[PDB]
Amino acid sequence: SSHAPTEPDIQKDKDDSIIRENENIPAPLGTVVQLLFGSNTEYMQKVITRDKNNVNVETIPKFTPSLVEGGSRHYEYTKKLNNSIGPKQTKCLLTESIEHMDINNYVLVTQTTKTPDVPSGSNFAVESKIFLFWGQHDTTNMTVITKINWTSKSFLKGAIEKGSVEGQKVSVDYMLSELRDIISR
Numbered sequence: 001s002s003h004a005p006t007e008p009d010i011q012k013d014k015d016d017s018i019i020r021e022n023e024n025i026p027a028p029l030g031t032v033v034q035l036l037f038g039s040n041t042e043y044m045q046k047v048i049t050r051d052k053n054n055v056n057v058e059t060i061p062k063f064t065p066s067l068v069e070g071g072s073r074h075y076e077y078t079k080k081l082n083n084s085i086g087p088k089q090t091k092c093l094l095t096e097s098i099e100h101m102d103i104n105n106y107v108l109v110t111q112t113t114k115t116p117d118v119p120s121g122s123n124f125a126v127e128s129k130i131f132l133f134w135g136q137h138d139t140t141n142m143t144v145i146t147k148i149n150w151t152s153k154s155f156l157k158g159a160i161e162k163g164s165v166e167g168q169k170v171s172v173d174y175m176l177s178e179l180r181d182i183i184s185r
Contacts, residue, residue, distance in 0.1 A: 002138050008106040008131040019144040019168045027183050030103045032140040050174045053080040072097045090117035106133035120154035144172050
């Protein structure tokens with residue numbers, strides 16, 4: 001009765017970094033997909049607002065045309081940065097795309113973040129692949145892989161890549177913590 005654990009089909013890319021891997025969420029795959037990406041979007045909104053640096057978090061739309069391979073959505077919030085010296089905050093422009101959906105195997109949603117107000121923010125977007133697949137005993141594993149798409153290379157490239165990895169890890173930890181709390185409550 002327990003679904004078998006599965007393997008995500010993670011295509012390699014030399015500028016990829018691992019954010020988190022094989023993080024367990026104690027609910028079935030279809031449930032976790034629905035909690036993050038389904039029609040009740042308050043859960044993903046709360047993932048974002050759990051970080052008190054995240055403000056102006058608009059209502060998140062559902063995936064259109066449908067929650068299906070090829071569906072996508074956009075939303076925006078603001079992230080507080082420095083206390084006083086610029087920049088004090090940045091807009092965060094998020095686009096999510098359903099790249100692969102197979103509840104018998106794995107789901108891949110790509111999450112791309114643009115931050116126009118950071119230094120060199122006009123030079124890059126952050127692309128994170130969120131893999132969801134089966135763990136043991138009808139639970140879900142999550143693996144997140146990140147790379148920076150440089151649309152113009154920056155003299156701050158190394159610092160930005162390090163801080164982005166650091167920030168993607170914090171973002172994914174809130175996602176995992178909220179998921180783990182929704183299930184337990």
